[PDB]
Swiss-Prot record, chain B:
One Pfam assignment: Oxidored_q2
Catalytic activity line of the entry: a ubiquinone + NADH + 5 H(+)(in) = a ubiquinol + NAD(+) + 4 H(+)(out)
Protein origin, superkingdom: Eukaryota
Biological process, per Gene Ontology: ATP synthesis coupled electron transport
Keywords: Electron transport, Membrane, Mitochondrion, Mitochondrion inner membrane, NAD, Respiratory chain, Translocase, Transmembrane, Transmembrane helix, Transport, Ubiquinone
Membrane topology, from the record: Multi-pass membrane protein
Membrane-spanning residues: 1-21, 29-49, 61-81
Signal peptide: none
Main location: mitochondrion
UniProt-listed InterPro entries: NADH_UbQ_OxRdtase_chain4L/K, NUOK/Mnh_C1-like
Lineage of the organism: Eukaryota, Metazoa, Chordata, Craniata, Vertebrata
A molecular function GO annotation: NADH dehydrogenase (ubiquinone) activity
Family per similarity comment: Belongs to the complex I subunit 4L family.
Protein name: NADH-ubiquinone oxidoreductase chain 4L
From Swiss-Prot, chain F:
Protein name per Swiss-Prot or TrEMBL: NADH-ubiquinone oxidoreductase chain 4
Alphabetized UniProt keyword annotations: Electron transport, Membrane, Mitochondrion, Mitochondrion inner membrane, NAD, Respiratory chain, Translocase, Transmembrane, Transmembrane helix, Transport, Ubiquinone
Molecular function via GO: NADH dehydrogenase (ubiquinone) activity; ubiquinone binding
Function: Core subunit of the mitochondrial membrane respiratory chain NADH dehydrogenase (Complex I) which catalyzes electron transfer from NADH through the respiratory chain, using ubiquinone as an electron acceptor. Essential for the catalytic activity and assembly of complex I.
Compartment(s): Mitochondrion inner membrane
Membrane topology of this protein: Multi-pass membrane protein
Gene (UniProt): MT-ND4
Cited InterPro entries: NADH4_N (IPR000260), NADH_Q_OxRdtase_chainM/4 (IPR010227), NADH_UbQ_OxRdtase (IPR003918), ND/Mrp_TM (IPR001750)
NCBIfam families in UniProt: NDH_I_M
Keyword Transport: yes
Curated annotation (Swiss-Prot), chain G:
Gene: MT-ND2
Ubl conjugation found in the keyword field: no
Enzyme Commission (EC) number: 7.1.1.2
GO MF: NADH dehydrogenase (ubiquinone) activity
GO cellular component assignments: mitochondrial inner membrane; respiratory chain complex I
A biological process from GO: mitochondrial respiratory chain complex I assembly
Catalysed reactions listed for this entry: a ubiquinone + NADH + 5 H(+)(in) = a ubiquinol + NAD(+) + 4 H(+)(out)
Residues passing through the membrane, by range: 3-23, 25-45, 67-87, 96-116, 122-142, 145-165, 178-198, 200-220, 237-257, 274-294, 325-345
Subunit structure: Core subunit of respiratory chain NADH dehydrogenase (Complex I) which is composed of 45 different subunits. Interacts with TMEM242.
Name of this protein: NADH-ubiquinone oxidoreductase chain 2
Family assignment from sequence similarity: Belongs to the complex I subunit 2 family.
Function: Core subunit of the mitochondrial membrane respiratory chain NADH dehydrogenase (Complex I) which catalyzes electron transfer from NADH through the respiratory chain, using ubiquinone as an electron acceptor. Essential for the catalytic activity and assembly of complex I.
Membrane topology annotation: Multi-pass membrane protein
Length: 140, 98, 52, 102, 119, 459, 347, 53, 71, 46
């Protein structure tokens, strides 16, 4: 929901930790529940026990992505103390990508996940810090 | 807010979920389409009678004559489906594979 | 000989037509004829022109 | 027990020599080859190459060069004749300026 | 734009369009449309396996006539639409003075510039 | 320049309704008429450009490149027979009219006022070359070559359009003159860096830079000769032309974000000049040679010196001429031996006693022999880069040594010493091939006499 | 299937779309959508085979449930402020349901799972007429009800529709599913610009309908369903090849051809707003939906597959089909780059 | 689009079913006649955003 | 001198062409910025004629003596 | 000559070509009349 992604933006950046990380786990678990709902509605896992198992795997992996991302974001922000550069979240996206590779137990997909997630997360912080509006003006 | 509107909107949402999830019978799908017709009928009619807006009481009669001829079209389609197969199951429709 | 082969004469006619449209463009964009600050003499002496 | 094809073994070395050893480079029509000789050795070398060489050998003063030569000669003669230093700095007027002051 | 002559719904051109000049003879856009009509005739001769540039000259002249006519009316409506856009823009310019202030154009004697010399 | 545009439109349908055995003389004669007509334009005097109602103008950034294209067209065309001679008359007319259309959009591209029109004519340059190299590429992966070509040029060139629309609706119209006169610096924010990165990255892909130069070599080994010369000379020098046009705006941040691109181009120049030493497939050596020279061009463009821009346009014109010639000699060798591989075709000193002189002269122009304009370009770029950092001259000279090494190795490997005594099908060289040689190199030397024309707008 | 009765049913399709175009009363719009459905069922099943039967079944179920959800939206609209004008709505919930009902009807990415299924088994005339009219008519209603739409709804459906119509299109070795995935991508484009300046969307509608008309006319010219048959129509009919070349590059969206005027004018009046990351994402995905066009063009004309004979028999008989209006629509679809100021013909 | 051939031909076939305060078949009131007459007298020559301002 | 006479445009001709074409393009750019200003302020206020989506046509509202005075 | 069992067409009718030329010349006359009316209206109003 927009209210708790706004809660994730509500923490100063800055550090108010355990709370930024819990918001990251909540966002990741919500996205994992979404993707698990799609993957259980488009497959017929046959049967309900395997459906619970697949939803548990997708939710736990996406929440662990959120957790590890929030951890390395919190630690990098405490150490280097720079809210200007998105290099902290570049490190964060690569750490999430390497742990996604660990949870899929491959290496090439993990390295590509480091690259793509790190660049997109640095882009997210970079465009938020300079200010690029979400989806619209909607004026002219 | 006229509390009966809550139960009629509840009946609409349940009839919609019944239209969406269904086990094997397309007959039951047409039947829930007929029920959803009835739900929109009763809600629009109680709207028009609360408003005393009796110039436009065209919603009930015309909505249900049109949606009933839709249901008749669906019934003829189910006749054709059960003609070119044995039954009208959701299974044995999985040909024309995407 | 021209009605026999006209093949080798078409693009000179095209270049002449392009040049004529260039001169039409010249007489269309003929503003500031003597209104610049650095190219401004008296209109002299022939007939009412400084370029064409 | 299979071939997967039907087509013929093609092509061959159709030598452009062994028929017309007087002939020039391209295909088998021995008149228009002479016409191609005429057009590419009169319109590539005779009327284009040496005419372009004499056109670039002298054209007007491209990028105002000899004009700049003679104007610099006359201006340095001026600034010798009046005793002021040639090429004073501050090409724009040092009075006509507005510095943003503290 | 939303009408702004949302009164006459499909008035294709009012008397407001009869005050601007129509598209003149040998304007380049109608000549482009005529060349496109000749190209349409060429490809219509091409598809039906009849000889291209032959035996369809009434169809050539038909296609050229049709495209020049339609493009002429489209050019007329186009020029009317841009003219009424310009006139409504200038009416809103002249209407509200104070939202569009004349920026005090300072000459370069005092306009400071950050320089950053590049080497 | 509409007097250049409308004869090109009046040249195309003539080839359509040209009779049999008469397409050739008509197209060649009228393109040479276009060459004299092109030579008429060279008039650029002093302070300003030479303008023409809104669409058209000319600078020395554009005038020698335009003369290069219209001089290249008959050379292109006369390379493009004898390898489609047995094909249909209709398909031959289709190919020749496709090349004429490609020339038309190239003249459109070099004589452009707005960068929007430059983008339209940029991908108009893109489209016919696809069809040409993929249809007539004459190998099993001309498919892959055309596909890599189109997807890299689109996928790089595309956000350039969005940045140009942004510059449109932030500064009014997009004349080159207004952008000379209404420009203002944009400081080190992040969005300035992204807009500069989008524009320069589109052009980087067109150059090619070293990060994305796998684009090129398949599209050179898997193309016919006309599209080969067009692709290499006019497309790479068109990319550099477009970068020289756009870099007048956005000065103050290129010092902050040009440091990766200069580094990538220098180390890639060294690696590419090393990789075109030891490969097979003789055609591809000149392809990576062009990659190395355009890397040098990129370093020259972005270090922003008037000496650097004069040497940049000199290196562009000289390498366009030399690489087009050397592609044509490679096509002559492939006509001979039907191989494309380097070590098979050998000898050619006893056999073909004057074709070797054109190989020698081409490899000496590639080597930067000192009256070649290649050396004038490389020399000015070396002067500017030693003014830029005072230590990067070592990479320049190492490039120089390796460049002379691989070009002269390409000479002496195939064409110094011993026929393999099983080739036995080479005929003595045609007058057409020698005509293309003396149409390449005689304007190079006669430009090398008085070369004050080809230097840039910072004359 | 008497031809008088077929003219009657086609006139009722025209009548349903005109009733949609013409009214201010919401029940007449629902009647128009329904009559469009009722008459567009038997344009299908022009053959006998049960593939058309199952396709008409799936299409009928999804189309009628979208129409009933729209009727729910109108009825809740009049539970609130009670007027029969097609204007700015007065309920965000009813605007939500109405946009999702139209999203189910004209095809969006959570809602498109019926579109290759309906276009696979039916003949080409039915597929053409349903793509043209069923992607035309709710754009009128969307143009009418645009001032009361949450932008997240349209924008998310449009982004996801373009990227799903791109990602699905790469795999299909059919033709109708390629055309249907391209339809989903273009409907995402034609919806994405709606809340900013709708002249762009409706001119995109004009251009897309001209393009799809040229496409399905060139496939009515020769009964082809796989690319193998496209190669054999290379070997039997040569001008068809270069027209498939030009029109497929025009569906690609390349600038000197007229497939560019839809995209680029949209990007202009899109990036005059402060959305830049979204047009560059959308247009990179429009780079993505071009590869299946490229392999289709490769299989037709740029490469030359081996061809089965009996074309030796077929060469005596020329292309004696019927063409709807092929050359006019073709050169209107291809050579219309420099008439970009025919943007303002629309309003 | 929103075509009003409705308006151009000069036939009112769909306008009579539009809101309250239109002609209910015998001269009767609705439940909220006057409040719609208020709102419609407020919001005629108004560009549908200052109708909500 | 002959080449400059018979082939080349005069520097006054080319120079005044540049000055006229810069005047034309200056009018174009100033009007384009004026257009975007007009459009953004008119979507802001809604006062102007453009962004006026159709409200209720009030020609059909009648008052005529009803069946109940408490309307 | 060379045909068997008919030439299907090739010998055209003499209503379709006359119809097309007639409506084409009619449309040319109508557009010329339209342009003359528009020039007259412009010079009468301004
Ligand atoms: C490669 C990506 C190219 C993205 C398109 C170029 C561009 O304008 O990027 C800026 C865009 C967004 O930046 P922007 O254009 O919104 O910046 C506007 C800046 N202010 C608000 C100060 C006026 O960045 C991206 O698309 C990042 C990728
Ligand atoms: C920073 C710069 C980024 C630049 C990106 C440019 C695009 C990427 C490269 C494009 C070319 C890819 C290509 O040609 O791949 C070949 C492959 C088909 O080859 P193959 O799998 O061997 O099939 C044989 C069957 N005939 O082709 C494919 O499998 C094509 C798959 C789709 C590729 C679409 C282009 C990329 C779009 C990205 C969207 C996000």
């Amino acid at each position: 929901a927009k209210t708790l992604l706004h809660q994730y933006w509500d923490i100063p950046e800055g550090t108010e930790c355990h709370r930024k990380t819990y918001a990251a786990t909540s966002i990741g678990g919500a996205s994992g529940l979404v993707v698990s709902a799609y993957s259980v509605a488009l497959k017929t896992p046959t049967s309900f026990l395997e459906g619970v198992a697949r939803t548990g795997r997708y939710t736990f992996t996406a929440a662990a992505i959120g957790a590890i991302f929030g951890l390395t974001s919190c630690i990098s922000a405490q150490v280097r103390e720079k809210p200007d550069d998105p290099l902290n979240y570049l490190i964060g996206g690569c750490a999430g990508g390497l742990t996604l590779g660990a949870r899929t137990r491959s290496y090439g997909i993990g390295a590509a996940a480091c690259a793509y997630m790190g660049l997109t997360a640095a882009l997210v912080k970079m465009g938020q810090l300079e200010g690029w509006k979400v989806f619209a003006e909607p004026k002219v | 807010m006229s509390l009966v509107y809550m139960n009629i909107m509840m009946a609409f949402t349940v009839s919609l979920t019944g239209l969406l999830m269904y086990r094997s019978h397309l007959m039951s799908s047409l039947l829930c389409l007929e029920g959803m017709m009835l739900s929109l009928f009763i809600l629009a009619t109680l709207m028009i009678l609360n408003s005393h807006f009796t110039l436009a009481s065209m919603m009930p009669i015309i909505l249900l004559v049109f949606a009933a001829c839709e249901a008749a079209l669906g019934l003829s389609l189910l006749v054709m489906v059960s003609n070119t197969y044995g039954t009208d199951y959701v299974q044995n429709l999985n040909l024309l594979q995407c | 000989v021209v009605r026999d082969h006209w093949i080798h004469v078409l693009v000179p006619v095209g270049f002449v037509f392009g040049y004529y449209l260039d001169r039409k463009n010249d007489e269309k964009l003929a503003a500031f004829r003597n209104k610049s600050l650095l190219y401004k003499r008296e209109l002299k002496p022939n007939e009412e022109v400084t370029w064409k | 027990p299979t071939l997967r094809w039907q087509e013929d073994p093609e092509p061959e070395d159709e030598n452009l020599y062994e028929k017309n050893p007087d002939s020039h480079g391209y295909d088998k029509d021995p008149a228009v080859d002479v016409w191609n000789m005429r057009v590419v050795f009169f319109f590539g070398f005779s009327i284009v190459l040496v005419l372009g060489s004499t056109f670039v050998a002298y054209l007007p003063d491209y990028r105002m060069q000899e004009w700049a030569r003679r104007e610099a000669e006359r201006l340095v003669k001026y600034r010798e004749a009046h005793g002021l230093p040639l090429m004073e700095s501050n090409c724009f007027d040092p009075s006509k300026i507005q510095l943003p002051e503290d | 734009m939303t009408g702004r002559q949302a009164r006459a719904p499909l008035q294709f051109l009012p008397d407001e369009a009869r005050s601007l000049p129509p598209p003149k003879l040998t304007d380049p856009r109608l000549a482009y449309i005529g060349f496109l009509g000749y190209c349409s005739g060429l490809i219509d001769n091409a598809i039906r396996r009849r000889p291209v540039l032959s035996a369809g000259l009434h169809r050539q002249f038909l296609y050229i006539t049709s495209f020049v006519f339609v493009g002429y009316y489209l050019l007329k409506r186009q020029d009317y639409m841009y003219a009424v856009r310009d006139h409504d823009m200038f009416s809103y310019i002249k209407s509200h003075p104070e939202d569009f202030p004349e920026k005090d154009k300072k000459t370069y004697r005092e306009v400071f510039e950050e320089f950053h010399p590049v080497r | 320049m509409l007097k250049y545009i409308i004869p090109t439109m009046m040249l195309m349908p003539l080839t359509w309704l040209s009779k049999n055995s008469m397409i050739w003389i008509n197209t060649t004669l009228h393109s040479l008429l276009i060459s004299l007509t092109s030579l008429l334009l060279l008039n650029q005097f002093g302070d300003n450009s030479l303008n023409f109602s809104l669409t058209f103008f000319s600078d020395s950034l554009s005038t020698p490149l335009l003369i290069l294209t219209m001089w290249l067209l008959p050379l292109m065309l006369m390379a493009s027979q004898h390898h489609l001679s047995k094909e249909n008359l209709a398909r031959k007319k289709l190919f020749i009219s496709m090349l004429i259309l490609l020339q038309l959009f190239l003249i459109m591209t070099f004589t452009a006022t707005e960068l929007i029109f430059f983008y339209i004519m940029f991908e108009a340059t893109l489209v016919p070359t696809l069809i040409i190299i993929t249809r007539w590429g004459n190998q099993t992966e001309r498919l892959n070559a055309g596909l890599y070509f189109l997807f890299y040029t689109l996928a790089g060139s595309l956000p350039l359009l969005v940045a140009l629309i942004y510059i449109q609706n932030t500064m009014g119209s997009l004349n080159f003159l207004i952008l000379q006169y209404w420009v203002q610096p944009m400081p080190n924010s992040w969005s300035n860096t992204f807009m500069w990165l989008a524009c320069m990255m589109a052009f980087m892909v067109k150059m090619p830079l070293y990060g994305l130069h796998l684009w090129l070599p398949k599209a050179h080994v898997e193309a016919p000769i006309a599209g080969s010369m067009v692709l290499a000379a006019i497309l790479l020098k068109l990319g550099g032309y477009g970068m020289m046009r756009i870099t007048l705006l956005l000065n103050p941040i290129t010092d902050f974000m040009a440091y990766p691109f200069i580094m990538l181009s220098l180390w890639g120049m060294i690696m590419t000049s090393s990789i075109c030493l030891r490969q097979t497939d003789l055609k591809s050596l000149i392809a990576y040679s062009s990659v190395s020279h355009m890397a040098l061009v990129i370093v020259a463009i972005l270090i922003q010196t008037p000496w650097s821009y004069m040497g940049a346009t000199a290196l562009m014109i000289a390498h366009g001429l030399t690489s087009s010639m050397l592609f044509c000699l490679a096509n002559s060798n492939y006509e001979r031996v039907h191989s494309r591989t380097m070590i098979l075709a050998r000898g050619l000193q006893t056999l073909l006693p004057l074709m070797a002189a054109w190989w020698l002269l081409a490899s000496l122009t590639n080597l930067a022999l000192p009256p070649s304009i290649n050396l004038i370009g490389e020399l000015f770029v070396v002067m500017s880069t030693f003014s830029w950092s005072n230590i990067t001259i070592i990479l320049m000279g190492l490039n120089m040594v390796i460049t002379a090494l691989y070009s002269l190795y390409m000479l002496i490997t195939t064409q110094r010493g011993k026929h393999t005594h099983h080739i036995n099908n080479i005929l003595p060289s045609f007058t057409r091939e020698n005509a293309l040689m003396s149409l390449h190199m005689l304007p190079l030397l006669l430009l090398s006499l008085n070369p004050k024309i080809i230097l840039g707008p910072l004359y | 299937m008497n031809p008088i009765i077929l003219i009657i049913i086609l006139m009722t399709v025209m009548l349903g779309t005109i009733i949609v175009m013409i009214s201010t009363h919401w029940l007449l719009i629902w009647i128009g959508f329904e009559m469009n459905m009722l008459a567009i069922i038997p344009i299908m099943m022009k053959k006998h085979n049960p593939r058309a039967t199952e396709a008409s079944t799936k299409y009928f179920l999804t189309q009628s449930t979208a129409s009933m959800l729209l009727m729910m939206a109108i009825i809740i609209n009049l539970m609130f402020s009670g007027q029969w004008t097609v204007m700015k709505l007065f309920n965000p919930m009813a605007s939500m349901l109405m946009t999702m009902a139209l999203a189910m009807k004209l095809g969006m990415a959570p809602f498109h799972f019926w579109v290759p299924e309906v276009t696979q088994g039916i003949p080409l005339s039915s597929g053409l007429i349903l793509l043209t009219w069923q992607k035309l008519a709710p754009m009128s209603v969307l143009y009418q009800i645009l001032p009361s739409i949450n932008l997240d709804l349209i924008l998310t459906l449009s982004i996801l529709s373009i990227t799903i119509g791109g990602w699905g299109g790469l795999n299909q070795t059919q033709l109708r599913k390629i055309m249907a995935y391209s339809s989903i991508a273009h409907m995402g484009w034609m919806t994405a610009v709606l809340l900013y300046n709708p002249t762009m969307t409706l001119l995109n509608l004009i251009i897309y309908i001209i393009m799809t008309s040229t496409m399905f006319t060139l496939f009515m010219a020769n009964s082809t369903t796989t690319t193998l048959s496209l190669s054999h129509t290379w070997n039997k009919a040569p001008i068809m090849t270069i027209l498939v070349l030009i029109t497929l590059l025009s569906m690609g969206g390349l600038p000197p051809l007229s497939g560019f005027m839809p995209k680029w004018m949209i990007i202009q009046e899109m990036t005059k707003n402060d959305s830049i990351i979204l047009p560059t994402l959308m247009a990179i995905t429009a780079l993505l939906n071009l590869y299946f066009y490229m392999r289709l063009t490769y299989s037709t004309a740029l490469t030359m597959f081996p061809s089965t004979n009996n074309m030796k028999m077929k060469w005596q008989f020329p292309t004696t089909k019927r063409m709807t209006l092929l050359p006019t629509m073709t050169v209107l679809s291809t050579m219309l780059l420099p008439l970009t100021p025919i943007l303002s013909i629309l309003e | 689009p929103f075509f009003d051939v409705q308006k151009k031909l000069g036939v009112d076939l769909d306008h009579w079913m539009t809101i309250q305060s239109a002609e209910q078949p015998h001269r009767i009131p609705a439940r909220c006649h006057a409040f719609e007459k208020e709102w419609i007298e407020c919001a005629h020559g108004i560009g549908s955003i200052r109708a909500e301002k | 001198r002959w080449i400059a006479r018979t082939f080349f445009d005069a520097p006054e001709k080319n120079y005044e062409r540049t000055m006229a074409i810069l005047q034309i393009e200056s009018e174009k750019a100033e009007l384009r910025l004026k257009e975007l200003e007009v459009r953004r302020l008119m979507r802001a206020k809604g006062d102007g004629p453009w962004f006026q989506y159709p409200t209720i046509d009030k020609a059909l509202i009648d008052h005529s003596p009803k069946a109940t005075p408490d309307n | 000559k060379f045909y068997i069992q008919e030439p299907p067409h090739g010998s055209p009718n003499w209503l379709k070509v006359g119809l097309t030329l007639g409506t084409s010349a009619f449309l040319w006359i109508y557009l010329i009349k339209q342009h003359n009316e528009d020039v007259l209206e412009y010079k009468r109003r301004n």
